[PDB]
Amino acid sequence: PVARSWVCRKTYVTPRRPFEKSRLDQELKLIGEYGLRNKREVWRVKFTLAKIRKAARELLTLDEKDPRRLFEGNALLRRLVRIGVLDEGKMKLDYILGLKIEDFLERRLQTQVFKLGLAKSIHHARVLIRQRHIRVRKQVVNIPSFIVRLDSQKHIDFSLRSPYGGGRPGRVKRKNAKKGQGGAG
Amino acid sequence: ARGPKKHLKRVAAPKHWMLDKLTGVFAPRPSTGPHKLRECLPLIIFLRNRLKYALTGDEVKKICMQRFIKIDGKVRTDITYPAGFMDVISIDKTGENFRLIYDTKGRFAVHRITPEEAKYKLCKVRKIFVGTKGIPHLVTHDARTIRYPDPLIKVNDTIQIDLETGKITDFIKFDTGNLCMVTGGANLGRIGVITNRERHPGSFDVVHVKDANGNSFATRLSNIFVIGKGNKPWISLPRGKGIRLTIAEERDKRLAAKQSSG
Amino acid sequence: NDTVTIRTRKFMTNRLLQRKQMVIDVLHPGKATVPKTEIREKLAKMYKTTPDVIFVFGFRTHFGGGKTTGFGMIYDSLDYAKKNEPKHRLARHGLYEKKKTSRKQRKERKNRMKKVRGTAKANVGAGKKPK
Amino acid sequence: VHGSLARAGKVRGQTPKVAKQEKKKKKTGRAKRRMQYNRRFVNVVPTFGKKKGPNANS
Amino acid sequence: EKTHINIVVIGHVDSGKSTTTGHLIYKCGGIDKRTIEKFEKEAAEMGKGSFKYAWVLDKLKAERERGITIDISLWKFETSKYYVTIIDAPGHRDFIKNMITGTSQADCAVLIVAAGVGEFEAGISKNGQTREHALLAYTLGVKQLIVGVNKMDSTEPPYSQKRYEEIVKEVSTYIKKIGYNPDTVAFVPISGWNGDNMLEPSANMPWFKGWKVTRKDGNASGTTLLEALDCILPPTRPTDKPLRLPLQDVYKIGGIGTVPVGRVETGVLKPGMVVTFAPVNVTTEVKSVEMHHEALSEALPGDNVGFNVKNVSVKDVRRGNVAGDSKNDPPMEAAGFTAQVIILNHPGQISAGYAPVLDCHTAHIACKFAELKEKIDRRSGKKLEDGPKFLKSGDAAIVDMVPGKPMCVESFSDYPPLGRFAVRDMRQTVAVGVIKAVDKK
Amino acid sequence: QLIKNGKKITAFVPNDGCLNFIEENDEVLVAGFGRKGHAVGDIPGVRFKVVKVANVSLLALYKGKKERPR
RNA sequence: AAUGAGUCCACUUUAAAUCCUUUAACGAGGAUCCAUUGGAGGGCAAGUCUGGUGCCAGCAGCCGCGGUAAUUCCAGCUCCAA
RNA sequence: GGUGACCACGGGUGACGGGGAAUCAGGGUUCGAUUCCGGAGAGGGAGCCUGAGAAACGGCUACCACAUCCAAGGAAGGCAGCA
RNA sequence: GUCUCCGUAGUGUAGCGGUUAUCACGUUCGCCUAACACGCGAAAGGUCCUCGGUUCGAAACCGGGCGGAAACACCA
Ligand SMILES: [Mg+2]
Ligand SMILES: [Mg+2]
Ligand SMILES: [Mg+2]
Ligand SMILES: [Mg+2]
Ligand SMILES: [Mg+2]
Ligand SMILES: [Mg+2]
């Protein structure tokens, strides 16, 4: 029949029990400090950390020197140090369990442009990313959840077409200028 | 069904064909020929996804119908002709020759050979019987049969068939200590030397193979192609010499190659 | 026009279809996707040929502008290009005409012609009445 | 039937219709989350009350 | 290309209303000789052989066995100059609502009164239905019409002058009273059961030397019905005006679904846009359109077509509903409307709260007079007095009413065919008028 | 009385004035009343509640978001 | 100051269209270009606010609320969860 | 003689089987009409020609159930294919 | 579309061309109780489905239309 794929998976897990003060306040603190839109995308990063920790624990259950354990452990550690959430000298499966969601939230492009001073606040950072003002290497990114690697950490910069790098001021600037010259010849 | 199937779904195609999932719903469905469809390489995918000489089935059809594709010294216009194991693909207009040999991962690789080496071809005999008038007969691993062979040649040995004549020029006996190649199962595409053959009457004989690195394995007797007299192969081996290396020493080779290229 | 460059990659020549094929990308910094004809003559200059044998298609523009990439096709001669090439790219260049009835009407005629046996005048007169 | 269905919609019927008070729009999405984080996390109050709830009817 | 004109045949019960038009449809080539002989044999058993031509229009078995027309029926043929369709009428006191449906969806009309003694006199009287037919003709917008007298073979002597002359003078003075011009309308003698004077001048009667019709478009002379009907005025087409389409009936045809049928008033309907039905307020894409089992690309005004719509059932949309394009102004349910009316006859006085039945286009809805605004002169629309308290016959007035049942109307100043309406009670047309202002719900 | 299998049931009408939106011979849609064929609350032997009437939801009529199909 | 959601030219895509990605020109100050669905006694986060009703209407998965001062119904305001 | 308390035989299935899916400490519990593989069927049965391959139904024959046309003498049917 | 029947307070119906009323009731109010339960007496409740016609006058005599309950056909 059809040549589709229909391979898809959910990226978040809802909490087992709702309406609990501690989890609600922690999640709201994370959202407010990191400028997230809703609770779904803090549950998403929690799910990502949970899957990584499950893989780490499963590998730790395997016997040492097992080639499958070694191969998957080095692959997982390499990915963890590429995304920058783990220290380069911390190449052990035990340290993977000690990582936190705050480590993953810090590597987001939205937090990164705020840390680099390109934005005045985290919400300014998000709205600045969404409007195609931020570029990585050469590609422009409008996705706040863009996880930035260590090699791509240095290459975050304003978009050339944006009215903060190259020229071409926005529509309101041009409208104000033409109104000013029309009122004042 | 009420008869033979003449379709082949894309996902049910053999894995070593390396077909994807999004281009279509169907697979080439190779025609009947010298080789089973499970371990054959129809010329459409060979000329479209290995060589990229064509972009679609229609372009490879135009390529074939201009009479440039030569298999075993004969021009084959069948777009879905089952090429199969170690049949020489000759393209005279661009002047290169291909020997179809499994790689280290058990897939047909793009192996280029010289024209003087392309003139001959190894064949594994499958059965030897005597026909009418007491005339001996010999059947290869292909569908090719030849009369009047050497009486020394026995079952599942290897013979040297030269093209444009179809005759036997030399043979290699299936003996312990001869270089072989596995043509089925998990050990597909692995080059090694015959070390032991334990035979089970009423079942499948099992033969043991050790490669140059010293890694020993075993496989069924039906999945072995003797390729060399002792240790020197009679064919040009592909990249890696058919030595299956594990992922641990594959990853660091990739890293070293990237560091050299970077 | 001031800042447009053609860079080729994955270039290869084949004699099976008597052509040289490649995939190319054009860098338009602040302009729209470059029209295919412009690629045609700029590549013809790039390979010292005429802007009639040049065949391009499949131009997808990357997100945020800048680079757009398509697959290039150049033949040795026009007769070969008419011989081995899909008819729709010929029609895009005007070298092939598609003046023909609908598939529905063609099926209607084919099914109506099945009702008349043998008789040439009536089997060709089958579609004259039900227009 | 015992005949008691004639009182259907009674209290809703007698409830005096009072119009909703027109009001400023509420921020939605990320801005709402920011505002409610600001209200209940970044603030210092010098007045007692044993941490009275956000809907205190004082 | 070739124009289309709707024709409606009105007359009396058993006046040959269907027999002579069966003759006509057979002579012009609507049916064959074999079918008419089949009708003859089927009428031979139960003795109603005189209506064998009438059963062509009388599609119902009940219509055949009862010998009368219960509801309208449709037929088609090609004339020597253009294309037309024909609608019969029930021609009975009980089925006035059915025939005003057909006459409302008309372009022209023909009226039939039997020339025999005892029927023409009963035909045109107070209880006589010819007055009702001719009145509703002008009420519902029959701008031009012809008249043909039937069954002068039973007259004494058959095919005679003075009988024809007295009946044409009677109907001529009646139509001069009603507003129609005797000069414009043709006067044709036709012998139905014998089948005379439809294609050729029947020489059994030589005293008739043809009629002359003089009109604003031009002049014409005639000796036969075909010569009369080929020179009718091609009615105007309000094509630019947005789509309006009342629904004569709804069918559930096997394999395609619901097919509402109605005569297109304004606009062009073609398969490929959504339509809206006003009394029920349902929105639905039109799928296909078809006149007389012939598929068409468009529905021009004045076309009595059946159009197929999608994903709906037969009970969603019913008779009397009006369709219109949602892309243009959509028709929608009306709370009430202001109407200027002409009171015709009523034994008592008319008061507020009087609830007769209003018959507009296809719809037949009883409307209750909310209150009376003012009385109006017969002519020129002149003011008489404000706030009336009663009404009598021979009067005009401005009155506001609300339909008891959901109904959609259009003011005459906007949609003329839907502006015309009639009022029926006690088996006469009590009031006639047009619509001026309509509120929208 | 259900359209299929002709069974007669009793269904609660769950709001303040939604009995007046119900007339005879209507086509109602009835769902379960909460706990899988078991009576709920102070209502003896009622296991169903009306969701829609005449192919329009009782919620829409109660909120007044749309009108009866007159 | 900055952007889209939309209008909308061209290119591109495509068998031909369409969509997406490019890209002209318009396009935001109640930026009215308007976020909803369910709740606020407990479970279970959220009101001992105000007006109606008075074991009536109704709510309530369960405990239970209502018999004239309802933290639970019908409404306004205000909060709560996604 | 053969099969049976190691459940024969019979009945029921809201049973096409599997690869798989949902839930997820571990162990398990439900669901797989559904795109891949195997099977069955073409309204219900039944019987055949041709062909290498059919008990074929976008082949035929017969009965049964529905159902089309008719000039009433006959003729023609199978959307659990795409719409 | 046609035909058949029915339609009075909220249900159950008396009803006369010259009076629509009662009844189990239903409701309300007094009637005792903190709340009841039982129990005593009055009131309201009708365009006679609606609109008209006949008549000096009709709910009822008739013509429609509406709602419901039956059946009949209705295939661009
Ligand atoms: Mg509340
Ligand atoms: Mg089953
Ligand atoms: Mg299955
Ligand atoms: Mg299958
Ligand atoms: Mg079968
Ligand atoms: Mg069969």
Side-chain angles (χ1 to χ4, degrees), chain A, chain B, chain C, chain D, chain E residues 2-441, chain F:
Chain A
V2 292
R4 326 296 166 74
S5 81
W6 50 74
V7 169
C8 60
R9 67 168 80 235
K10 299 218 315 202
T11 44
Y12 76 107
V13 166
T14 67
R16 166 75 173 81
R17 56 178 72 248
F19 317 131
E20 61 181 0
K21 291 297 295 295
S22 66
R23 188 191 45 82
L24 284 180
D25 290 331
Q26 182 65 41
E27 281 161 332
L28 196 47
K29 181 179 183 293
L30 298 186
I31 281 181
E33 198 276 332
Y34 290 107
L36 313 177
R37 168 173 93 253
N38 51 7
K39 296 285 182 71
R40 210 201 282 116
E41 64 184 1
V42 65
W43 299 341
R44 165 213 303 156
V45 58
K46 189 168 76 171
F47 189 47
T48 311
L49 182 67
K51 286 174 53 153
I52 290 172
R53 291 189 68 256
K54 172 154 176 289
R57 163 166 76 258
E58 193 273 335
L59 280 187
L60 273 173
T61 59
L62 273 71
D63 190 0
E64 185 65 27
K65 189 176 174 66
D66 182 351
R68 216 188 61 92
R69 150 155 182 170
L70 268 165
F71 184 78
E72 292 181 354
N74 302 121
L76 173 64
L77 288 164
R78 189 190 72 92
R79 294 192 275 111
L80 284 188
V81 303
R82 284 183 79 244
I83 59 175
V85 306
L86 194 47
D87 179 273
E88 204 266 330
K90 268 173 206 167
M91 301 297 272
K92 296 288 185 301
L93 289 160
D94 290 338
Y95 304 139
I96 306 177
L97 302 186
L99 292 175
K100 296 178 284 185
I101 53 182
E102 291 84 3
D103 292 330
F104 282 76
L105 282 166
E106 191 273 331
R107 299 304 311 167
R108 289 171 46 109
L109 190 49
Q110 168 181 358
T111 63
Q112 279 305 318
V113 290
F114 175 50
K115 292 294 177 68
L116 270 295
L118 300 158
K120 315 170 88 170
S121 66
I122 192 74
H123 303 76
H124 178 223
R126 208 203 172 78
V127 305
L128 189 66
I129 285 178
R130 284 297 298 162
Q131 306 162 339
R132 300 150 160 265
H133 294 271
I134 304 304
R135 89 193 199 259
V136 182
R137 302 243 163 201
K138 292 183 182 293
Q139 171 62 272
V140 294
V141 189
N142 71 312
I143 310 285
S145 48
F146 176 89
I147 304 302
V148 172
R149 317 205 185 102
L150 280 193
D151 58 356
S152 48
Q153 183 63 75
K154 191 255 290 180
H155 299 77
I156 297 145
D157 188 15
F158 271 120
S159 178
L160 305 188
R161 303 287 309 291
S162 66
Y164 297 120
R168 208 52 176 75
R171 75 188 194 192
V172 288
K173 180 70 175 178
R174 297 184 277 125
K175 205 190 183 189
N176 283 25
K178 63 180 68 177
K179 186 56 70 160
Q181 57 94 42
Chain B
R2 284 173 290 143
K5 304 291 213 62
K6 54 192 72 172
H7 279 98
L8 187 59
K9 301 295 194 160
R10 171 63 68 116
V11 76
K15 185 70 178 295
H16 62 102
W17 289 1
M18 301 208 283
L19 292 170
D20 53 353
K21 306 149 59 175
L22 266 297
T23 47
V25 178
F26 294 106
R29 183 65 192 197
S31 65
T32 56
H35 303 87
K36 307 187 161 281
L37 70 93
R38 307 300 311 173
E39 66 273 16
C40 84
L41 196 68
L43 272 296
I44 180 167
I45 59 174
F46 176 69
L47 296 147
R48 191 182 49 181
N49 298 115
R50 292 307 103 82
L51 303 172
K52 275 91 179 158
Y53 287 162
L55 298 199
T56 49
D58 297 76
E59 292 182 355
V60 72
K61 178 252 294 179
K62 304 193 183 213
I63 286 174
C64 282
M65 292 301 292
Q66 296 191 21
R67 299 178 75 82
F68 301 140
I69 302 309
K70 207 184 306 308
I71 305 151
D72 272 21
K74 292 183 181 180
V75 167
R76 303 276 177 209
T77 61
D78 198 359
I79 183 172
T80 57
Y81 182 94
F85 186 46
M86 74 199 313
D87 285 334
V88 175
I89 316 296
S90 290
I91 302 107
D92 290 331
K93 193 170 183 70
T94 60
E96 71 272 15
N97 293 319
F98 300 106
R99 183 79 67 107
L100 211 55
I101 298 174
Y102 301 97
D103 67 341
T104 57
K105 291 194 192 307
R107 315 176 306 229
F108 282 128
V110 180
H111 184 91
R112 300 182 182 272
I113 47 172
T114 60
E116 70 274 15
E117 196 277 333
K119 264 177 56 49
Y120 65 70
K121 161 189 177 171
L122 290 189
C123 294
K124 166 195 181 159
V125 57
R126 282 211 178 147
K127 65 174 67 177
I128 292 169
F129 64 98
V130 61
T132 185
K133 313 304 179 73
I135 303 307
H137 287 74
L138 190 139
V139 183
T140 71
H141 81 280
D142 309 329
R144 155 187 288 106
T145 176
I146 47 180
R147 314 192 294 143
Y148 304 124
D150 202 317
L152 281 182
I153 287 151
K154 300 286 98 176
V155 180
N156 67 12
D157 290 7
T158 300
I159 57 169
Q160 181 64 261
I161 297 298
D162 51 346
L163 302 178
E164 301 291 329
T165 65
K167 294 181 176 67
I168 295 183
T169 63
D170 208 358
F171 66 97
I172 316 157
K173 206 94 160 164
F174 182 89
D175 201 271
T176 300
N178 287 333
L179 194 68
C180 68
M181 183 176 177
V182 185
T183 55
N187 301 133
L188 181 62
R190 295 186 79 173
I191 298 293
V193 168
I194 301 297
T195 68
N196 188 52
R197 164 173 181 217
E198 54 184 20
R199 63 185 67 189
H200 313 104
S203 159
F204 307 99
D205 291 15
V206 177
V207 61
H208 301 262
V209 180
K210 179 209 293 315
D211 55 4
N213 292 48
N215 291 318
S216 194
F217 50 94
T219 193
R220 289 183 177 181
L221 185 50
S222 68
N223 276 337
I224 281 290
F225 198 109
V226 180
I227 68 155
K229 178 52 191 56
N231 59 348
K232 273 75 176 175
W234 280 11
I235 59 170
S236 66
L237 305 181
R239 270 151 64 90
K241 291 311 156 295
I243 300 283
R244 163 161 308 157
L245 56 87
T246 62
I247 45 174
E249 68 271 16
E250 193 275 333
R251 148 178 59 77
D252 48 5
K253 277 188 69 175
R254 283 202 297 105
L255 302 180
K258 155 169 294 203
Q259 192 270 340
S260 63
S261 63
Chain C
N1 185 37
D2 51 355
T3 312
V4 162
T5 185
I6 299 296
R7 299 177 70 88
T8 193
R9 80 171 181 270
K10 286 166 138 36
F11 177 87
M12 61 91 90
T13 183
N14 57 3
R15 273 82 72 188
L16 296 177
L17 294 174
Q18 312 92 20
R19 76 204 190 182
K20 307 199 284 292
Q21 54 204 12
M22 72 291 290
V23 61
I24 59 172
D25 52 356
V26 61
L27 282 73
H28 43 101
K31 318 164 195 176
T33 301
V34 176
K36 275 183 299 186
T37 74
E38 182 68 27
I39 294 92
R40 270 180 71 200
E41 71 266 12
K42 198 171 189 296
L43 188 43
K45 306 180 174 37
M46 189 162 160
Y47 274 95
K48 277 75 68 178
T49 60
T50 61
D52 59 350
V53 70
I54 308 299
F55 276 102
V56 299
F57 61 100
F59 276 110
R60 318 303 289 277
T61 302
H62 295 105
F63 185 81
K67 273 191 54 188
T68 185
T69 306
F71 189 78
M73 299 188 93
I74 65 171
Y75 289 84
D76 48 352
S77 66
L78 183 62
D79 54 24
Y80 288 163
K82 297 163 171 283
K83 190 175 294 296
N84 49 19
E85 186 69 26
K87 311 300 190 182
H88 66 269
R89 285 180 214 156
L90 274 298
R92 277 160 190 198
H93 286 174
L95 281 72
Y96 186 104
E97 57 87 19
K98 205 178 173 61
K99 261 60 199 170
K100 54 175 64 65
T101 187
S102 163
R103 199 182 84 132
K104 180 59 68 178
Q105 293 179 356
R106 186 153 71 258
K107 291 163 174 307
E108 300 292 284
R109 179 176 173 83
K110 189 260 293 179
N111 280 11
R112 281 197 303 272
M113 285 179 35
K114 270 191 274 191
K115 318 287 273 296
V116 160
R117 183 254 199 281
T119 61
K121 62 95 176 179
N123 210 1
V124 306
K128 288 308 170 199
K129 328 187 184 200
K131 68 183 178 68
Chain D
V1 67
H2 48 87
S4 301
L5 301 151
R7 262 169 290 111
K10 191 176 77 71
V11 171
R12 211 204 187 201
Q14 318 169 241
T15 300
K17 213 69 55 186
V18 60
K20 293 179 142 101
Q21 305 216 270
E22 308 293 87
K23 62 184 74 67
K24 190 181 54 185
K25 65 176 284 188
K26 293 183 182 293
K27 294 183 186 294
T28 60
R30 182 212 73 256
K32 200 180 146 181
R33 296 291 175 173
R34 163 176 212 198
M35 166 279 282
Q36 65 183 177
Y37 160 81
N38 270 349
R39 291 188 293 113
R40 69 181 70 187
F41 274 70
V42 62
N43 76 314
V44 167
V45 291
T47 312
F48 200 69
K50 300 178 176 185
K51 302 295 186 291
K52 186 63 65 68
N55 204 41
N57 276 358
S58 178
Chain E
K2 186 173 292 293
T3 73
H4 175 78
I5 295 90
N6 309 108
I7 300 303
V8 296
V9 190
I10 59 171
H12 291 284
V13 60
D14 292 331
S15 54
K17 51 195 176 299
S18 300
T19 310
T20 187
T21 189
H23 284 279
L24 184 64
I25 192 61
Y26 165 73
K27 297 178 65 48
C28 70
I31 68 169
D32 50 59
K33 188 180 183 294
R34 185 184 69 256
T35 44
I36 211 163
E37 290 306 284
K38 291 179 75 75
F39 278 118
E40 184 269 342
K41 304 175 285 279
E42 290 203 335
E45 293 89 6
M46 65 181 180
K48 200 172 322 294
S50 69
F51 290 164
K52 64 180 178 177
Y53 307 95
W55 287 358
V56 167
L57 267 293
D58 283 325
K59 64 183 182 293
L60 300 189
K61 168 65 55 167
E63 273 175 347
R64 285 178 175 99
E65 61 88 20
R66 202 169 284 275
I68 52 165
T69 314
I70 311 293
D71 202 359
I72 61 170
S73 69
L74 264 288
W75 284 97
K76 63 176 282 293
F77 58 97
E78 172 65 33
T79 70
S80 292
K81 190 175 172 66
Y82 41 81
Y83 181 57
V84 297
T85 189
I86 49 170
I87 319 183
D88 58 349
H92 196 296
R93 151 177 187 285
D94 295 325
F95 319 127
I96 296 282
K97 44 170 288 196
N98 304 55
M99 60 81 67
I100 54 189
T101 294
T103 62
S104 60
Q105 63 182 357
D107 290 336
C108 166
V110 64
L111 190 149
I112 297 182
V113 182
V117 61
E119 41 261 46
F120 166 82
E121 295 83 4
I124 183 165
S125 52
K126 170 68 171 64
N127 198 3
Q129 299 300 289
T130 289
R131 318 268 283 284
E132 304 189 4
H133 293 87
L135 166 69
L136 62 87
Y138 202 100
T139 295
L140 296 179
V142 181
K143 297 297 104 188
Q144 69 274 16
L145 62 86
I146 58 172
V147 61
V149 59
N150 183 33
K151 297 293 190 291
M152 72 287 291
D153 58 356
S154 67
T155 60
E156 46 272 15
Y159 308 99
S160 152
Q161 200 92 356
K162 64 182 182 293
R163 185 66 173 169
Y164 179 66
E165 309 306 322
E166 71 203 57
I167 62 174
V168 300
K169 301 327 292 172
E170 181 65 26
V171 304
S172 300
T173 193
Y174 180 49
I175 64 170
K176 190 260 178 183
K177 178 61 72 176
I178 210 62
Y180 279 115
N181 193 10
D183 168 48
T184 58
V185 56
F187 285 75
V188 182
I190 58 172
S191 177
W193 171 237
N194 289 322
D196 296 316
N197 198 352
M198 280 76 74
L199 292 174
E200 71 275 16
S202 181
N204 62 342
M205 52 89 72
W207 51 257
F208 186 70
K209 310 319 290 175
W211 61 93
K212 174 74 186 66
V213 295
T214 296
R215 199 179 294 111
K216 273 72 62 182
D217 49 18
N219 305 325
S221 296
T223 68
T224 44
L225 287 178
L226 271 295
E227 195 174 1
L229 60 86
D230 288 331
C231 58
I232 206 65
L233 193 145
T236 185
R237 296 294 182 258
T239 285
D240 53 351
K241 200 168 286 187
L243 171 65
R244 279 296 169 283
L245 173 49
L247 297 184
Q248 187 270 330
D249 206 358
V250 173
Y251 300 126
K252 190 167 77 173
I253 318 293
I256 52 178
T258 64
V259 179
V261 171
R263 195 273 300 275
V264 186
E265 291 322 304
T266 63
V268 167
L269 169 64
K270 62 181 67 179
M273 80 288 290
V274 67
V275 303
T276 318
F277 303 88
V280 304
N281 204 56
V282 307
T283 179
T284 295
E285 175 71 29
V286 65
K287 189 174 178 180
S288 66
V289 73
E290 198 195 75
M291 180 186 288
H292 280 111
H293 295 88
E294 285 293 88
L296 313 176
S297 162
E298 285 180 350
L300 302 176
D303 289 335
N304 204 40
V305 302
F307 63 105
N308 180 222
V309 297
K310 64 181 290 185
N311 63 325
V312 291
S313 181
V314 287
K315 297 297 290 183
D316 302 81
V317 191
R318 66 181 64 252
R319 184 179 64 248
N321 297 171
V322 54
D325 202 328
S326 194
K327 294 179 72 68
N328 296 103
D329 59 303
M332 60 87 70
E333 173 69 24
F337 55 106
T338 77
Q340 189 274 331
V341 291
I342 297 191
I343 301 172
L344 306 178
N345 65 319
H346 182 222
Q349 65 182 357
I350 298 100
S351 182
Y354 178 42
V357 294
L358 192 144
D359 308 330
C360 188
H361 42 278
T362 301
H364 298 89
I365 312 294
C367 65
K368 178 185 286 290
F369 292 139
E371 84 279 346
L372 273 297
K373 310 314 298 281
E374 65 186 4
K375 292 192 192 233
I376 308 299
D377 187 38
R378 169 198 205 156
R379 62 177 60 88
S380 196
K382 281 157 45 66
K383 177 70 175 178
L384 314 179
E385 72 257 21
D386 218 323
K389 275 73 68 178
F390 88 109
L391 292 171
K392 283 309 209 48
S393 167
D395 197 35
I398 295 289
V399 60
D400 300 343
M401 74 291 289
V402 288
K405 203 173 302 309
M407 184 178 178
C408 181
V409 296
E410 291 291 326
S411 63
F412 185 78
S413 57
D414 297 332
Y415 281 116
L418 278 81
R420 303 290 183 90
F421 69 89
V423 166
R424 167 171 36 107
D425 191 34
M426 318 319 195
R427 305 288 78 76
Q428 75 270 14
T429 309
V430 182
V432 288
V434 293
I435 310 183
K436 297 293 180 68
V438 180
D439 58 3
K440 310 304 286 179
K441 286 207 55 45
Chain F
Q1 184 177 3
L2 298 175
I3 283 157
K4 61 168 193 187
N5 70 60
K7 277 172 191 182
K8 297 180 183 180
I9 63 170
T10 300
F12 182 58
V13 178
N15 260 323
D16 204 295
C18 290
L19 193 86
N20 318 319
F21 303 112
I22 304 298
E23 67 271 15
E24 296 294 329
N25 287 340
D26 290 332
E27 184 178 2
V28 289
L29 188 78
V30 285
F33 191 64
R35 52 192 295 177
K36 283 82 181 171
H38 192 201
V40 183
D42 52 7
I43 320 167
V46 171
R47 282 84 61 86
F48 315 98
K49 70 181 193 298
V50 184
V51 175
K52 305 175 64 164
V53 58
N55 197 1
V56 60
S57 167
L58 276 182
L59 190 139
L61 299 166
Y62 186 79
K63 290 185 183 292
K65 311 177 85 71
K66 62 181 73 175
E67 188 67 26
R68 279 280 331 278
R70 282 286 96 187

